[PDB]
Specification:
heterohexamer, A: mainly beta, Rieske Iron-sulfur Protein, six-stranded antiparallel sheet, about 0% helix, B: alpha+beta, Naphthalene 1,2-dioxygenase Alpha Subunit, Chain A, domain 1, N-terminal domain of TfIIb, 3 domains, four-stranded antiparallel sheet, 11 helices, binds 9H-carbazole, binds FE2/S2 (inorganic) cluster, binds fe (ii) ion, 2Fe-2S (chain E), Rieske_2Fe-2S (chain E), ferredoxin hydrogenase activity (chain E), oxidoreductase (chain E), NAD (chain E)
């Protein structure tokens, strides 16, 4: 039901970490301060990898066209993006970050 | 360098230089015509990367001068005056330039002018290879032509024959269409497919990871920069097009397998091998003329060991390959390129396009082009480079 | 929504939204063609408010899709491929959309693509009424068509007939030409005047009680928004044109009384009653195509109780009305509109125009349109909305 | 005022006003047609300095009104309506203006309008001289016509005949092409040279005393401002054109001596004397129509003491001078002017041009024009002057 | 009929405008600049706008239609597109009562 | 070889003086502060006289097109100038300005 991403300490605040999953689409784990969030890695506007973008607070900016999403809600923040990003549940149990196998 | 709205360039972080390269990439070799098109002492005009140029053949050798007099900026070609074998005299006030180095060697209207031997008209290196005329639209010493051509194009036994024309679309739309793995769909009804019994799917269901979809060549023995389309490596060819589960279209089930490998190379030349027949290759350039037009320089190559084979090939080319493939197949590419003009004309399609899986090939090309081009042609290069201290 | 230099908009404080609406008003219904012009299974293209659209008739019902593939932005119409009754397949990479909701339901070049079922091509509501095709160029569920139509156009007994064509001028110049009280001076030699024995002054000049001649409507029950120019009931007819005191031209002293009341309604439709005959009405739209052109959608209404009457009317229309009125009378309005293009082309005509009394009705229209339009169409709407 | 990029104007400190005068100089007299071209009650349209104008002849006198109704800005000329001999009625809403003062005197659609008598359409002075129609495109009381005409054009016996046409080049390119001493190289093969036995070098080059060949005139009693290029007396004739020291072309060794002295005068009229014959003079105007076009107003003057001489000259003009000189000689000046359009179209040519010694005369003209012009026509003058309190 | 009673000086705040309608004649506009009063035709000379509905900035009235403006003291144009001077009418205060002339100044 | 041009005090700071030479192209002597420099007087981009231009520090601006050069190196400082100016070393001895006979 959950997958081991990393130790909450390996990620500096404001950084992104791509989570490749066997037999499925990749996810992106973001650390916004002390909280960790997760969404699908692929930008809904195309085929870009959001983990290669820029995180500004709780908003992720896609590297391809500058579209953006709120990593907490998955809702679009900047055009040209219009399709909500799939959001996945994250849990930090014992200083270790875990991501739900399925999207909330 | 400053050809597109800065706000747009900021958005396309993956390939800003490519998006900015509306006029093409400076400092690369580009084919513009065939050797047979320019005869001794018969200057020919053309526009390349937005620049008006003049090409002449003197004692068998080609020379290229910018078709713009240094004096009042008129094109020398409005009324060509070659008064000596090695020079060209402007029809206006008679400023005379040497084809060899562009030096202003005489001024008929004022032989005592202090400008004589003190000014120089821009010249560009020109080279003939495989019956094609290449011009190095760049500055300083040129690199080997091999750097800007696809592998094998220059092979000794490779016989090259082609066709060139002016197409109304920015060069990049032409490059992307040619390297587009899924655009194969527009060729489903080509006469070549049926008349040459080709196997041709409607597209591909990608297989493997993103990295396996392409093979980027960052350096060749000669410094070539390009990308191979490997979608067929692990991808599943689509021969039955379905809508709602119902078959509405089928690919072509021919016996001839072509286009085993497709690669795009800087400054913008596609190599399809083998094509349009198992025993030959296609090399085609999309040469920037100005921001809205390009030369669609098509060539078909075939290894030929003697004169008998070359003659035979030339016959097959004129009677079959040129009309059935170069025109019969690629004509659909022409209007497809034209169809993308409006969306990208305001530079906003570079932001609004919605890409899908097979576009990984195009993305790899945009990044390779952005990282390895030898310079961005700007409107300033056309009018005169600008700088103020 | 920034279509004009801000320095100019700042100057026209009374109606800046109107001056800024060079591409027209978004979120309104607009007639673009006649029902008889669109056949079952035969997609038709057109440009409305700068947007390229495709209209198709499936099982008798009309559907509208934006004529621009989501993928590389090509027009699907370059090479139409409707492979199943309810869909359209782009000729380029075969992205397939459903006419009914625009959903990307299939992709022939890659049936496994993650985009399938996750993207949607823009669709616009389409409604047919009085044999006219109306497209709601807006977002969200559309308001009643009646809101954007002049009074009586939709009466059950009202038989509508007309013609449509593309004219080279911004839509607003067309609107103001039409709702202009004094412009009929250009129609003084129209064959309709003599050949239909009309009473037509050279110019309907402003009476005394001004706000009695102009009636702004913003209390219409169905939401209609417009302005009436009550020339016949409160305005004055000028039948003898003079220069230096000497008569140099006379209006028409015919017996048929027409144009008792004129009204202009958002999004841009004029109603002339009665016209071109005492027992008829003219309803004409000036539909924005792009900033330089508009559809001049002309319709003539005449109550009819039975087919026998509809046929008779249809015959008179073809032999007299269309030829003598819509063309014979309104043709001069075409080059008249074109004549104003240069002055307003740079947007400066909206500052330098020198208006006179009869323009009071036009001013009322500009304020009404500025206050009650449902949105300003912008080039960003055309290319793709932008926001950070 | 705001016609050219300020960055460019800052670079041409020597003649910024001139470079900014793309639309021409306001407040000067300009010829626009010949008298016999405008008859009684026959309104004629024309565009001068970017403004649409209407000219009419009433009781023999010429009147000029701006072809733009004050109401909705339409051109009155779309459907001319002259109801009374002294007025014109806009075809739209019937606003009626007097030709004499432009006053809105009546409004057929509303005789009680408060605008009547309170508005005035722009009028411009018009005066006929030597069969030519001059319009003072300026504001306020005009100066004497003589100020904007070259010496001798208005002499009592000087018989003037000519031709006029619209040429597609900015007026300044026309002026500089005409006052250019080295450009006659383009006329070396003109039929006039042989057919009229002219002596014409390949180019008049700078003599020894520069300041002495060019003569800036700003002390003329009638107020005219111009520059003489004293080629015949102080200049050097180049008859042997050489490349590498070898003669490749020679000038004409005819007997007739012409072009002794050439002068350019504000607002932009060239005087060539004597030409095209030793007993004649050529006066030509390059009148600004808009930023891209101009009237090439050609006139040839020749003293005539009576009607018999005038009639004789007229016949010679139609049979020889017009076809042989005005056309046979100057036709090459037309495409020459057009050839410079691209270089200066973006205003960059005014910075990138590489001048040589004979252009010294043109430089003097640029300075004089910049310092003595009577006003810079701007787009605002065309749309309506603007000013915020 | 030479002087028209408008209102009490105290009825007008500095920097305000009041329209004065007249039977059988065009309306006037009275402006209060500080403690001084001025008046001109109410109708903008550039069209049919009412200047009393415009914005007063110091002694300059700005037309609400196209942004043109005039100096309320001289009636001269201050901002384009206005080019025709406004007729100015003398204003006098007799016993705290504002009066505007029935005829404009000649010049 | 050396050419005696003038007394140092003959030139005010930041000014330019043209030095004509019979049979040879004229030269321009610039006084930058209390230092002196010399180059060919003719702009390499045309027929303009640099001595009639604008001196800004060690850069002379051509009066014709705004082109410019560094009077010390002679190298182009501003477009459209592209051809290097001829430089002539200068020495001040006993309050007298001397300029090299030939470029060097
Ligand atoms: C006044 C009188 C008649 C008309 C008008 C304004 N505008 C119109 C538009 C179409 C047909 C007739 C009219
Ligand atoms: C030099 C020599 C002759 C002429 C000239 C410049 N410019 C001209 C313009 C018209 C006719 C003759 C000439
Ligand atoms: S692919 Fe992410 S914004 Fe386009
Ligand atoms: S423009 Fe070529 S010599 Fe003058
Ligand atoms: S542009 Fe339509 S499917 Fe690619
Ligand atoms: S536009 Fe001329 S009277 Fe209305
Ligand atoms: S009506 Fe007052 S500025 Fe135009
Ligand atoms: S002549 Fe000096 S910058 Fe051109
Ligand atoms: Fe193709
Ligand atoms: Fe009309
Ligand atoms: Fe000439």
């Amino acid at each position: 039901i959950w997958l081991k991403v990393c130790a909450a300490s390996d990620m500096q605040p404001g950084t992104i970490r791509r989570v490749n999953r066997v037999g499925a689409a990749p996810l992106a784990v973001y650390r916004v301060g002390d909280q960790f969030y997760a969404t699908e890695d692929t930008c809904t506007h195309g085929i870009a990898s959001l983990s290669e973008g820029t995180l500004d607070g709780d908003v992720i900016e896609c590297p391809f066209h500058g579209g953006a999403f709120n990593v907490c809600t998955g809702m679009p923040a900047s055009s040209p993006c219009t399709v909500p990003l799939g959001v996945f549940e994250v849990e930090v149990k014992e200083g270790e970050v875990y991501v739900a196998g399925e999207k909330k | 360098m400053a050809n597109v709205d800065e706000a747009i360039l900021k958005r396309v972080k993956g390939w800003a230089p490519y998006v900015d390269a509306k006029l093409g990439f400076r400092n690369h070799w580009y084919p513009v015509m065939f050797s047979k098109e320019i005869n001794e002492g018969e200057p020919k005009t053309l526009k390349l990367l937005g620049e008006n140029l003049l090409v002449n053949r003197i004692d068998g050798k080609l020379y290229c001068l910018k078709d713009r007099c240094l004096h009042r900026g008129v094109q020398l070609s409005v009324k060509v005056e070659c008064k000596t074998k090695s020079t060209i005299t402007c029809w206006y006030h008679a400023w005379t330039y040497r084809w060899e180095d562009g030096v202003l060697c005489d001024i008929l209207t004022n032989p005592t002018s202090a400008q004589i031997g003190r000014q120089k008209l821009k010249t560009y290196p020109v080279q003939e290879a495989k019956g094609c005329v290449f011009i190095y639209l760049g500055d300083g010493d040129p690199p080997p032509l091999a750097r800007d051509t696809p592998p094998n194009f220059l092979d000794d036994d490779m016989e090259i024959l082609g066709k060139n024309q002016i197409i109304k679309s920015n060069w990049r739309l032409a490059v992307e269409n040619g390297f587009d793995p899924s655009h194969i769909y527009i060729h489903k009804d080509s006469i070549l497919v049926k008349d040459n019994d080709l196997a041709l799917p409607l597209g591909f269901a990608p297989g493997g990871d993103r990295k396996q979809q392409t093979r980027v060549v960052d350096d060749d023995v000669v410094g070539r920069k390009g990308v191979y389309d490997l979608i067929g490596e692990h991808g599943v060819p689509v021969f039955e097009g379905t809508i709602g589960g119902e078959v509405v279209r089928e690919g072509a089930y021919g016996e001839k397998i072509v286009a085993n490998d497709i690669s795009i190379w800087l400054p913008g030349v596609l190599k399809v091998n083998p094509f349009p027949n198992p025993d030959m290759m296609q090399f085609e350039w999309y040469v920037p003329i100005d921001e809205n037009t390009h030369y669609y320089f098509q060539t078909l190559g075939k290894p030929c060991a003697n004169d008998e084979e070359r003659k035979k090939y030339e016959q097959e080319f004129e009677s079959k390959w040129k009309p059935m493939a170069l025109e019969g197949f690629n004509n659909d590419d022409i209007w497809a390129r034209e169809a993308m003009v409006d969306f990208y004309a305001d530079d906003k399609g570079w932001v609004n396009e919605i890409l899908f899986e097979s576009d990984e090939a195009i993305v790899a090309w945009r990044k390779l082009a952005s990282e390895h081009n030898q310079g961005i042609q700007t409107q300033a290069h056309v009018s005169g480079l600008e700088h103020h201290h």
